Automatic annotation (TrEMBL), chain C:
<protein>
    <submittedName>
        <fullName>Major capsid protein</fullName>
    </submittedName>
</protein>
Length: 481, 481, 50
């Protein structure tokens, strides 16, 4: 009686929701689709792959569309030997944990707050004086309550043996820049720092790229274990056509253009960290000093094979694809107040920004976007259009956590900040907002950074700003532009 | 002036995106739906439930559709007593940690690499010699750099007291096979190993089945804690009709067919691990030896009640549902080169494969798909159609991590490999690609496994291959087929 | 086979489309394939040590 009465208890308001219902929950409807197949094919580079060099590949035409694209990287296992035991000790310098430049830079900021005879003190006494000076510095700069000295003395249990390892997220770090080219024109460009920021914000829970890019979430012991043997990494290249099947790049519609991936590789000296400064780093299998020619890479492409009728239709009329392109503003930082002039073009969906200390970069911690003592490097930021506040001054947590909560699949674990003009900037096919930067005379991101950011040992810290913008790729008569 | 100018700054390209806009972001539109209610009802098995037996239930007709289906399992708490203190010590044998068959099998592979007097050595000296021989084995087989001996000596802090526990993910392990039957015909079949693989790949972040199936992510101390008391598990049965409301099984349209769930239960000896070989395992409440009749299970079904008009429409014309069925190829492995002949039928969406060492199975670690020393058991795999490479030789990481990244909600934490012909194999209502195996004369999965896989103590290791295929379930005149 | 002796005798697969082509092989017994130095030796697979 009650369940039937609920179906009868309808009024004029229910008519807007349920009158002439076009859907039922109790019967499945499905759509028929055209026939297609997927094939994954690995292809060698057209030029030699080496650390610090640029390499390119011309993408083969082994199907009708191009869908997924992965850079397959093979890194050798690492071993170490004392320089005294080596017949040829001359190698490039690597970052070493016995010379922690990031910790030395952090100590340099607290030196003015050390009370007593620091120079003559025992090692254990120096560690105590540094921890007390950190409390005095943080009280003076941040009105922070002092932490117990014992809570600041975190011994990272480093192993009592010699090692070397590939840096955190080495699969991204290796790709300093990649360019997707069609007919000799650059269609899009991606950077190592952008790839990491995109994975932090858009990386879905349970599908994080951890193993596929050599990322351990800053657990040095796991990087050491992984680096003792050969590593095979599959780094996704997040081009517009890899984001949705309807955006797959129509190879058949671009028949008269070569499709090329160009990759600028990281220098070998930046890719490795060692336990001690006096160690030589060896290729684990070959027992020779590691060299720039030990980088191996290939391109793994997923091709789509279409039925003849769909292939012929696509060849006759591929039309236009909405694309997202990436733009970059890269700036050196030498002061706590920084203004970035964002000379980006087109309808910008969103931008990302973050800072890297010089000391973190020099320590080989390339994706450590933290400030001094691991703090947030940004105090506040403001966004100006033509000297008018588009976003008034907001604290770092608003740009990092509130913007990520509103617009992104994930909140960043590092100090990555974002701002979206789009309601759904991760939707590759549905435009949901933008600001046209080609119609603004000035776009300025004004930053107030933490105290002493870009001073002394951190002179030439880096500001990264990346923007995502809409453009249109047109296919006509076997050409793409 | 700027924001109004952006709305006016439109050209012929914007017309394809925004001309005659059929959607606004500033006004919600909603659809009205028909009246329905959901009811969860628990039902006993029609036959006795016991370990190692087969049991069935005829599903009641308590609503118009059948939606969710959970196997509700009740396991008793476990206690242990010394065999010497027990009035009836005769029980089935259980796996025991004092007789670690998996560790003994791993040691057997490194015995040829032990230098010195192993037989006469002290226990601590034997552990050192085994860790050194592991380095020599891994250097010889994999060109691995040696790990410090202290880093290989992981003491799992096992408690200094007697215990027994239910094996990891016991809720899946208990279900050796389940069959969904309609009118005496098997509509679909699921296996323990498939349920685990499906949860690894399709299990969403924050909705993993951990507690609901007794899974701890291989933390033995948590399995011990859970096993001291009665456990109630709710194991989801992932039938086609549980995946989307429009696929709910139309009970009213199948009025003349009995709906049955058949379950083949795991043997009790495989479900329990104990600290020591000389312990008797007791039911914690009853203080009697644990026996095959201590398994309790019931079926929890979610029924849908429809409004009379929708019920009558569905009874008159339920039509056809697209269904996904599961197929299995199960093979013994006795060599490092394995060819699996996949005699699957219908349009296959995707397949999963993985290996289990005999030693891992015998140790009671039923979902440990790792190789020797916890390594990846697959070096490479190739997929052939009619002796032509459909997927050329690819390394294990491509089949495990790249395929999961492209097509699945999650990457597997275990050595589960997949391959999809579908762009969205987790979409239950939208076909997005398949390969029709009923039109292929041969489908071969060729595997190169790690060295010594399936040799000696691992003779009769297991290869599992599961496929998901499209079929059609038709409803006509109160019958389903 | 006759078709391996001269290119003009190559077996025309296209002309035999409705027939399966099969090679059947009867293998020698393992006991006949091996000779050993001494009667009291066990013969092992060199890699597998079985």
């Amino acid at each position: 009686a009650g369940s039937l009465t609920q179906l009868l208890a309808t009024g004029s308001m229910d008519a807007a929701l349920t009158q002439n219902a076009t859907r039922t929950f109790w019967k499945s409807s499905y759509q028929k689709h055209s026939l297609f197949a997927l094939e994954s094919i690995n292809q060698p580079f057209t030029t030699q792959v080496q650390f610090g060099a640029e390499s390119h590949i011309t993408v083969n035409r082994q199907g009708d569309l191009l869908s997924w694209m992965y850079l397959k990287i093979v890194l050798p296992g690492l071993k170490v030997q004392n320089q005294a035991d080596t017949v040829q000790p001359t190698q490039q310098s690597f970052a070493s944990l016995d010379n922690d430049v990031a910790a030395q830079a952090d100590v340099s900021h607290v030196l003015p707050y050390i009370e007593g005879a620091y120079t003559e003190a025992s090692l254990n006494t120096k560690e105590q004086l540094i921890a007390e000076a950190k409390n005095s510095y943080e009280a003076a700069k941040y009105n922070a309550a002092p932490l117990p000295v014992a809570a600041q003395m975190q011994s990272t249990e480093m192993p009592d043996f010699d090692y070397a390892y590939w840096t955190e997220a080495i699969g991204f770090h290796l790709i300093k820049r990649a360019e997707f080219k069609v007919g000799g024109a650059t269609i899009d460009t991606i950077w190592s720092e952008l790839l990491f920021a995109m994975e932090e914000l858009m990386g879905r829970a349970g599908r994080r790229l951890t193993e596929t890019i050599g990322r351990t979430l800053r657990r040095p012991t796991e990087l050491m274990k992984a680096s003792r043997q050969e590593q095979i990494l599959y780094v996704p290249l997040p081009w517009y056509f890899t984001k949705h099947p309807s955006l797959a790049f129509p190879l058949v519609a671009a028949t008269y253009h070569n499709i090329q991936l160009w990759v600028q590789w990281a220098q070998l000296n930046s890719c490795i960290i060692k336990s001690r400064s006096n160690l030589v780093v060896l290729h684990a299998e070959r027992n020779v000093p590691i060299s720039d020619d030990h980088l191996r890479a290939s391109l793994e492409c997923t091709y789509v094979h279409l039925e003849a009728a769909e292939r012929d239709a696509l060849t006759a009329n591929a039309g236009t694809q909405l694309i997202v392109q990436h733009q970059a503003h890269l700036q050196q930082v030498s002061s706590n107040n920084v203004t970035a002039r964002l000379n980006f073009n087109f309808p910008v969906l969103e931008f990302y920004y973050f800072l890297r200390r010089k000391a973190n970069k020099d320590a080989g911690d390339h994706f450590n976007f933290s400030g001094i003592g691991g703090r947030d490097p940004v105090v506040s930021a403001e966004l100006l259009f033509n000297n008018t506040a588009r976003v008034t001054q907001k604290p770092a947590v608003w740009w990092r956590a509130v913007q990520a909560l509103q617009f992104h699949s994930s909140a960043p674990l590092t100090n990555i900040y974002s701002y979206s003009f789009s309601l759904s900037p991760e939707d590759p096919i549905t435009p949901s907002g933008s600001a046209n930067f080609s119609r603004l005379d000035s776009v300025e991101l004004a930053l107030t950074l933490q105290d002493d950011f870009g001073a002394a040992h951190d002179a030439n810290s880096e500001l990264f700003v990346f923007a995502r913008s809409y453009n249109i790729l047109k296919f006509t008569n076997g050409l793409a532009g």
